[PDB]
C-alpha cells in the first residue's frame, strides 16, 4: 500500500539469485502491508536476504530459508520463528518479543534478551556464552552449543534443555522447574535444589562425569523411603 515499501520490495524482488522465490515473497509482503496482517510468513522460500519488514506485524515466520542476517525487527513483534537458516547473528530484539526460536543456525553470540521474553529456543547454534536471563522466562533451550557455563535461572523457569554442551557447574534450580534435560555435559555434581523439585518433575543427567560421592549422595536420597523429589535418570 505504502509506495515507499513497494519500491524497496520491487527492487529486492529483482535482485535475487535464481533459487530464491522472491516473487512469492514480494506478493506476500504487499498483501501483509495492504491488509495490515499480524503475521508475515516467508518460510520455506529459499531466501538469502529479507528486505525492510512491514512495521505492524506481531508474528514473523521465516523458518527454513537461507538467511545469514536479519533486517531491523519491527517493534510490535511478539513471536519470531527463524529456525533452520544460516544466521550468524541476530539484530536488537524488540521489547515486545515473547517467543524466539532461532535454533539450527550458526549464531555465536546473542544480543540482550528483552524483559518480556518467555520462550527461548537456540538449540544447534555455536554459542560460547549466554546473555543474562530475563525474569519471565519459562522455557530455555540451548542444547547443542559450545557453552562452558550458564547464567543464574529466573524463578518462573519451567523447562530447561542444555544437552551436549560443556557446562561444568549447574546453578541452583528453581522449584518452578518441571523438566531438566541435562545430558552430555561436564557436570561432576548436581545442585541440592534438584532433589527439591516436584515429585512429577523430570531430570535426565545421563552422560555427565558425576563423581562417586555425588552418586552415593543421590542414591541415598532418591532410594530412601520418604523421598518425594523428582525422578532422576542416570542413563
Amino acid at each position: 500500500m505504502n509506495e515507499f515499501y513497494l519500491k524497496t520490495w520491487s527492487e529486492w524482488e529483482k535482485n535475487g539469485t535464481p533459487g530464491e522465490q522472491r516473487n512469492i515473497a514480494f506478493n506476500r509482503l504487499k498483501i501483509c502491508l495492504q491488509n495490515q496482517e499480524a503475521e508475515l510468513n516467508l518460510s520455506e522460500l529459499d531466501l538469502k536476504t529479507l528486505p525492510d519488514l512491514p512495521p505492524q506485524i506481531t508474528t514473523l515466520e521465516i523458518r527454513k530459508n537461507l538467511l545469514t542476517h536479519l533486517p531491523d525487527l519491527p517493534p510490535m513483534l511478539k513471536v519470531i520463528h527463524a529456525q533452520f537458516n544460516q544466521l550468524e547473528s541476530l539484530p536488537a530484539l524488540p521489547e515486545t518479543l515473547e517467543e524466539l526460536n532461532a535454533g539450527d543456525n550458526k549464531i555465536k553470540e546473542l544480543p540482550f534478551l528483552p524483559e518480556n521474553l518467555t520462550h527461548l529456543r537456540v538449540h544447534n547454534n555455536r554459542l560460547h556464552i549466554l546473555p543474562l536471563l530475563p525474569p519471565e522466562l519459562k522455557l530455555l533451550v540451548v542444547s547443542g552449543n559450545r557453552l562452558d557455563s550458564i547464567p543464574p535461572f529466573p524463578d518462573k523457569l519451567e523447562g530447561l534443555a542444555l544437552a551436549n554442551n560443556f557446562i561444568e557447574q549447574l546453578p541452583e534450580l528453581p522449584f518452578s522447574m518441571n523438566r531438566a534435560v541435562l545430558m552430555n555435559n561436564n557436570l561432576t555434581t548436581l545442585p541440592e535444589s534438584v532433589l527439591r523439585l516436584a515429585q512429577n518433575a523430570f531430570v535426565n543427567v545421563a552422560g555427565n562425569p558425576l563423581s562417586g560421592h555425588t552418586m552415593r549422595t543421590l542414591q541415598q536420597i532418591t532410594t530412601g523411603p520418604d523421598y518425594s523429589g523428582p525422578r532422576i535418570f542416570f542413563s
Binding site: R121, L139, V141, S143, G159, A163, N184, F202, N204
Partner: protein
C-alpha cells in the same frame, strides 16, 4: 540414505525417527523418553501430538 547421528548420542540411529521439528533421534531412545510420558522432542522441547507413536 547416509549416516544420521542421534541428536543426543551422535550414534547412527539404528532406526532414525524424524520428529515434526525435524530433529532425529534413535527409536529406542525415543521410546525410553515416551515411556516416562515425556511426549516432547528432548533437544528442542517442542511438544508432540497426543498418543504420538514413533
Amino acid at each position: 540414505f547416509g549416516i544420521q547421528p542421534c541428536s543426543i548420542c551422535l550414534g547412527d540411529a539404528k532406526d532414525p525417527v524424524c520428529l515434526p521439528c525435524d530433529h532425529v533421534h534413535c527409536l529406542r531412545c525415543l521410546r525410553a523418553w515416551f515411556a516416562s510420558e515425556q511426549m516432547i522432542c528432548p533437544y528442542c522441547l517442542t511438544a508432540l501430538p497426543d498418543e504420538f507413536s514413533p
